[PDB]
Amino acid sequence: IWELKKDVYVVELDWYPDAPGEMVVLTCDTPEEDGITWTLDQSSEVLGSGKTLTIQVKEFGDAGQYTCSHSLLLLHKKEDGIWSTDILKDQKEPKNKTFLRCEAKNYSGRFTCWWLTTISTDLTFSVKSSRGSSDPQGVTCGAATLSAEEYEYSVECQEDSACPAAEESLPIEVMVDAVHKLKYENYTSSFFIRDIIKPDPPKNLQLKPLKNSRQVEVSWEYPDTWSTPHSYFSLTFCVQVQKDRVFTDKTSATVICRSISVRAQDRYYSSSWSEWASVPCS
């Protein structure tokens, strides 16, 4: 039995039919003693009375907005040893049992995480984060939100006193609270910013064809959001025409026309390529 937010509690239960419930006790926070009434929200039945209601939790119906002070009860399911992961969709893709996915645009310390649900009804979401556990360090996160419609939510965070040049050696952890109705789940994701980088696309391509040559000189520039100084935070670029690719860490290349695109990649860690940037060959 524990306190989530203000006036809200979670009750952990082995969801097995034969398993014990929890003998729960709702102290009515209102020092008034007197003959007192006790109900479960829209439920007319004075389920109990006195001051300290007491009950058997074991089912959702046994869960709810109790009223005398306030008191909300949400349940945490536990099946066969593992907590429920109903509210969110296992985006599988990254590594299975991957509910929360994040991305970073550079070594700024800033990053977006997003998830998926099939739900549309009551759906509240809490979000916290930090770097390290045995002595966490600060991360400040924004707020959960509908991003696209399966319905997608995302949030934005920023590592606090973050030097882009710092070697990371304790990962960042993102904690997500999900409450769909009276059910309570919570997710977790651990990563190093360097592993979740996906950079924006190469900025402003350019052809510069040469006489006596079907061979062209393609060029571009680092995207504006990338980390500086560039020579320190190198991106490697893939230059394609449409195999016939060209890999380089320069901001130009020589190809042969007949379109032309370029995407970027951190030079060392995350392999996530940036969205393509193209140009008409002719």
Partner: protein
């Protein structure tokens, strides 16, 4: 520059295969520009002075530490008829080259291949910033 590539191929290879293995230089060589940022008082510049030798000295010490670690490991490891393998011999050769220019045990090795990759990366970043222009 024949060096830079040697360093870069080792990094690419570490990058590609490190999953199949289970388990202050950064400031002393901090780029001038990163100084403008609160949270990062020496630095180096796009041209590549006492700060400069501090940076390089720091890199060189880092390498000596790792060079010993790898040779010790490689000595132990030689008893495994599977002889040695390679990322460590790769990292080691690069360490040697860079210096010139300037189960229980299998776990201890995993740990190290990792710790050094993170550090060769840094070294590689300063080295790349120092050519630049």
């Amino acid at each position: 520059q024949n060096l830079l590539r040697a360093v870069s191929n080792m990094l690419q290879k570490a990058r590609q295969t490190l999953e199949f293995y289970p388990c202050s230089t950064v400031e002393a060589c901090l780029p001038l520009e990163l100084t403008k940022n609160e949270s990062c008082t020496s630095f180096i510049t796009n041209g590549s002075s006492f700060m400069m030798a501090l940076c390089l000295s720091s890199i060189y010490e880092d390498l000596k530490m790792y060079q010993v670690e790898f040779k010790t490991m490689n000595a132990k490891l030689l008893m495994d008829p599977k002889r040695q393998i390679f990322l460590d011999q790769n990292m080691l050769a690069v360490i040697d080259e860079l210096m010139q220019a300037l189960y229980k045990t299998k776990i201890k090795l995993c740990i190290l291949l990792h710790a050094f990759r993170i550090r060769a990366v840094t070294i590689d970043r300063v080295m790349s910033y120092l050519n630049a222009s």
